[PDB]
Amino acid sequence: MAGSHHHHHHGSMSEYIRVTEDENDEPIEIPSEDDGTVLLSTVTAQFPGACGLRYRNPVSQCMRGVRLVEGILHAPDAGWGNLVYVVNY
Numbered sequence: 001m002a003g004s005h006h007h008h009h010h011g012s013m014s015e016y017i018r019v020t021e022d023e024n025d026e027p028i029e030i031p032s033e034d035d036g037t038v039l040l041s042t043v044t045a046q047f048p049g050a051c052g053l054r055y056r057n058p059v060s061q062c063m064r065g066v067r068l069v070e071g072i073l074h075a076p077d078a079g080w081g082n083l084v085y086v087v088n089y
């Protein structure tokens with residue numbers, strides 16, 4: 001689909017992941033990887049026991065979900081954002 005992970009150039013940037021467990025609470029800011037994913041070491045830092053994280057947006061009305069591989073959570077083609085994540089296991 002004209003897209004491969006092999007595609008990498010010099011000057012790569014690294015963003016952060018902003019997600020919250022509850023809706024009443026606020027989106028916590030945690031460290032992430034340069035590729036855009038997030039190490040499981042950081043997920044357990046604020047989200048202990050969180051095996052799977054989903055995407056929840058009241059304005060988007062979507063039901064997307066964060067990708068999980070080798071423990072590292074991969075972000076979508078849009079990024080992390082400041083939405084709420086759902087814990088699943």
